């Protein structure tokens, strides 16, 4: 007598009128004239924006920093729209359209002679940011497959997550810090300048606490 269990119900769920992902433009409608500095800190450290779920229950979670150019947006849109069931699934963008101008110099040119002309636009992303959020009358196992396919093709470490798996991820990291048996932690040594270690550390390490190196996020670091 195989024991059956109640199936989850999605009767309260409601699908928006436009379920598919909308088109993202290569560049903003009004082209930017003022050229901007490189500002690599915009992809460094933990994300503070778009870290929580809004409408849907599933999403792709960024595990590193990186820039999303238009080519990536087309990969995400075409893959998800083609793979999703419009009747039972809906997807929304959790990242703005490319807005940061990237300059390039003419091929074969020497150093100097002023800054290069604007070439294309990108969207900066920090680790911990939700990139695309999906919802509807479906389970995580249904969308995990094609969401993971998209995550692998992003220019940074990423993984498909849900409301449950995301919360479990954060709870596990909090538990590891609480039950850690190493009496020495990067936080304690850095904030107290023990051994004069701050002579080889960045001011950002006081808040990053050894979990971030450049654009890379180290999830096993406590």
């Amino acid at each position: 007598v195989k024991t059956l269990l109640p199936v989850p119900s999605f009767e309260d769920v409601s699908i928006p009128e436009k379920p598919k992902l909308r088109f993202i433009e290569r560049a903003p409608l009004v082209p930017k004239v003022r050229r901007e500095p490189k500002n690599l800190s915009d992809i460094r450290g933990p994300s503070t924006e778009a870290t929580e779920f809004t409408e849907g229950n599933f999403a792709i979670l960024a595990l590193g920093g990186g820039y999303l150019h238009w080519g990536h947006f087309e990969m995400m849109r075409l893959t998800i729209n083609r793979s999703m069931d419009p009747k039972n699934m809906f997807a929304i963008w959790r990242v703005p359209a490319p807005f940061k101008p990237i300059t390039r110099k003419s091929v074969g040119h020497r150093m100097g002679g002023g800054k290069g002309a604007i070439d294309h636009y990108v969207t900066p992303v920090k680790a911990g940011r939700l990139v695309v959020e999906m919802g509807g009358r479906c389970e995580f196992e249904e969308v995990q497959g094609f969401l993971d396919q998209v995550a692998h093709k992003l220019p940074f470490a990423a993984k498909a997550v849900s409301r449950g798996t995301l919360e479990k991820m954060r709870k596990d990291q909090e538990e590891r810090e609480r039950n850690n048996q190493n009496p020495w932690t990067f936080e304690r040594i850095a904030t107290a300048n023990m051994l004069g270690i701050r002579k080889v550390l960045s001011p950002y390490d006081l808040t990053h606490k050894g979990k971030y190196w450049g654009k890379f996020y180290m999830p096993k670091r406590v």
Binding site: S106, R110, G112, G113, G114
Partner: peptide, 18 residues
């Protein structure tokens, strides 16, 4: 050897007022 461009931003060389 390619012929390069020039910067279009002039001025901006004022010293600090102290």
């Amino acid at each position: 050897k390619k012929s390069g461009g020039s910067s279009k931003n002039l001025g901006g060389k004022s010293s600090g007022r102290r």
